[PDB]
């Protein structure tokens, strides 16, 4: 429970919706890497870690086991379904906002359960695609998750953005607005 | 209204005083409920919930499974820790400090730093200010950087110099950013 | 290097 450093080697996730899985390694609550199960390749999130190699067959055989373990628990628990938890959406900038200077907008979707969400960037109803990236689902102690989405921007006084979050825990898509000021 | 069934496995390593204390807590979860776990300190599987009692009883009866789980503290935790000693634990990103009036309020933006250890102190003419200060919690950007915003309710006069004092492990000496009326 | 922990099969589905 209490230590200097906590790591997950790794976060093995598998669920019936899709079905889909997720394999990651975390160190002090940040995503070290993820394995692309489809492409069968390791994607590092911190550049100094790119010097290392992670056999993707560990992730694939691990998820293959979790697929077995899940079906075993679906049966054992007379199909006790996951509860749709209301996620927490917060939008903020990576650095102080100046009208000239370029920045990044961070959209944090916290308390994600079950881990199935759509995080989209909008600007006056139109969707932003260029300059948007995402983290994997990052684990939490309560066995819930969180995801972050980054939108590169050039702050302007008349351009505002929205973070559209679609989760079953929400009755209507949540739109978190960001006004440049 | 989609029904989801989630299974998680987390191979968690807890480290303290570098190499001195190491603990492996392998957690098996269905959906937000930890059902069974292998703790390096207990040295055997134990059920967390009556759903994991069949898994704990099966895996504990297999000496082969039990002995590989007992070797994992050296195989996964101690071994992976040596890679962090050269990479993630060598990472130091010096904080960018900035003061901007938001005036009756001063905001000290302490952005893009790593690791999390930080101290931010406000000062009005070399005397420390505490009563009129409010800080954000430590914000995780998710891109292996943190940020913290420290506000101070001020009422300035001619001759007042507001100072933001910031301490971080990456720094040789603390950073002091001034602001004048 | 980096090494992963391994989940084992649940009995028996």
């Amino acid at each position: 429970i209490v230590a200097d450093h906590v790591a997950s080697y790794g976060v093995n996730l598998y669920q019936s919706y899709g079905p889909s899985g997720q394999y990651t390694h975390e160190f002090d609550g940040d995503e070290q890497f993820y394995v692309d199960l489809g492409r069968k390749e390791t994607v590092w999130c911190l550049p100094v870690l790119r010097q290392f190699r992670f056999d993707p067959q560990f992730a694939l055989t691990n998820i293959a086991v979790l697929k077995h373990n899940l079906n075993s628990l679906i049966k054992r628990s007379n199909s006790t379904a996951a509860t749709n938890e209301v996620p927490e959406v917060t939008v903020f900038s990576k650095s102080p906002v100046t009208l000239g200077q370029p920045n990044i907008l961070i959209c944090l979707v916290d308390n994600i359960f079950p881990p199935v969400v759509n995080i989209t960037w909008l600007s006056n109803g139109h969707s932003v695609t260029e300059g948007v990236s995402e983290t994997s689902f990052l684990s939490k102690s309560d066995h819930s998750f969180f995801k972050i989405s980054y939108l590169t921007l050039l702050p302007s006084a008349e351009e505002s953005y929205d973070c559209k979050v679609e989760h079953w825990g929400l009755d209507k898509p949540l739109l978190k607005h960001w006004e440049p000021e | 209204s989609p029904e989801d069934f989630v299974y998680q496995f987390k191979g968690m390593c807890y480290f303290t005083n570098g190499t001195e204390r190491v603990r492996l807590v392998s957690r098996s979860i269905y959906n937000r409920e930890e059902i069974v776990r292998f703790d390096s300190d207990v040295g055997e599987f134990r059920a967390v919930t009556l759903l994991g009692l069949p898994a704990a009883e099966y895996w504990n009866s297999q000496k082969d499974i039990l002995e590989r789980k007992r070797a994992a503290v050296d195989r996964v935790c101690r071994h992976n820790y040596q890679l962090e000693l050269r990479t993630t634990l060598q990472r130091r990103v010096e904080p960018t400090v900035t003061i901007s009036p938001s005036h009756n309020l001063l905001v000290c933006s302490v952005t893009d730093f790593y690791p999390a250890q930080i101290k931010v102190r406000w000062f009005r003419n070399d005397q420390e200010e505490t009563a009129g200060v409010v800080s954000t919690p430590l914000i995780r950007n998710g891109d292996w950087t943190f940020q913290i915003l420290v506000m101070l309710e001020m009422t300035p006069q001619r001759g007042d110099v507001y100072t933001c004092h910031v301490e971080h492990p990456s720094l040789q000496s603390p950073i002091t950013v001034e602001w004048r009326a | 290097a980096p090494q992963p922990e391994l989940p084992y099969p649940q009995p028996g589905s």
Partner: T-cell receptor
Amino acid sequence: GVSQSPSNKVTEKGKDVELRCDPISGHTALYWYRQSLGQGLEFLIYFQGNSAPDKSGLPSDRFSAERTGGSVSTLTIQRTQQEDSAVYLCASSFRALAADTQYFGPGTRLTVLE
Amino acid sequence: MKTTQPPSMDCAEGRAANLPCNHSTISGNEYVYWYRQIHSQGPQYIIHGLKNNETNEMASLIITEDRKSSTLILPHATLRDTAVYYCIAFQGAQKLVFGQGTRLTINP
């Protein structure tokens, strides 16, 4: 233990053969090998659940394995050739890539003739 | 890590049969596995270990402190213990590969 059927199979070239393996109860990893003499253990394919992560190791496109199960496995050699002759061994562990013990079956002695 | 073993050995029934194996280049995650094969059937798993000493009802396994050498002990040799003995260095990533083994012969 691991079961294998048929124990023996003497066939003419060009005819298709189907080899079967019944792994140990609770063994999610299944391995297929072949062994000639004078020669050693030759890896063909393996399964984790009902999917084969290592399809390389198979001698030709004539060779294919299945485990729809994912318990019982079947290896099929369509249009058999002389060089296909060997003892086809099957093995099973609890799980793959965990350095778990592989328990072998009695084998299938396949002999293909011209 | 590869293993080395005497090509063949002739031991008398009624006494323990110590079969040596050298593996100077063993890595920390590699198990010392022993299989046997009777002319010519499915290979039989006997025993394995990491650092400790292990005892089956089939055999015992002694691994040196440095892990560079190991011994398989057949408690009480019988005519049935006549087989080819394979000492293997096994880790997760790897596939099972047998060497030349020891052609053990148990003489009456």
